[PDB]
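To assess whether the prediction recovers the assembly geometry, we first specified each molecular entity separately, as shown.
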Amino acid sequence: LPEAGWVGESATEPEGVIPTSKVTWANRTLVAEEVAVIIPVPEAVIDDATV
Amino acid sequence: LPEAGWVGESATEPEGVIPTSKVTWANRTLVAEEVAVIIPVPEAVIDDATV
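The predicted structure of the complete assembly is given in tokenized form:
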């Protein structure tokens, strides 16, 4: 995070000068990974079922 | 001719597996073979005969 400061009206004193400051960022990642299952069943069981 | 079966329902036991089968064909052939005869006679006998 940057930091600011209070500044006097002056053209000659050090308190007349606005501070410089930086802001910085870093990186985070979403990496997609696969989760899965296979459920085998007789075709006759699937054809027979009303539900 | 292909041969069928009654195929059970197990995912694990051999009674659950549909049997493989096999139609086949064969070749019959007409092969042309020659039947022949030569019948020789004297040119005078033809001339002297009534038929």
